[PDB]
Amino acid sequence: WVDKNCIGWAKEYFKQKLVGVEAGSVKDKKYAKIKSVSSIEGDCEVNQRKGKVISLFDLKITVLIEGHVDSKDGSALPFEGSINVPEVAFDSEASSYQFDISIFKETSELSEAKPLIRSELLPKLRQIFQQFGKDLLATHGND
């Protein structure tokens, strides 16, 4: 009468939290923004053993990213992308998270994309992930 899967709720939470996060504000020459959450696999169960209700959740999350950077001269050239984080778990530390950044149809002229992602979009996802656990138990973790 306690085991409550949440793979469902987490799928909604991240979709509602990730989509929209950006590395800039559209204007800048170098800009990036997450287009959507393509995949959320793993397990997000919430068990209730003893006064403590818990979840040994371990999720693999992937998302799509839109953006444009500093072209060779004037106007900025666009790019498609994805970011894979193999593990967002109950015992993750802000720094535990790994971000595999991939650029679709990447050209030596899309160099500044990744740097832009690493220093501007990642520390946001790291804090977004750190919060997940709380907002998770805060819900499906009480009567």
Binding site: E45, L56, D58, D91
Partner: peptide, 10 residues
């Protein structure tokens, strides 16, 4: 096993 998988990662 879920518990087993967690222990492996630690």
């Amino acid at each position: 096993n879920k518990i087993m998988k967690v222990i492996r990662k630690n």
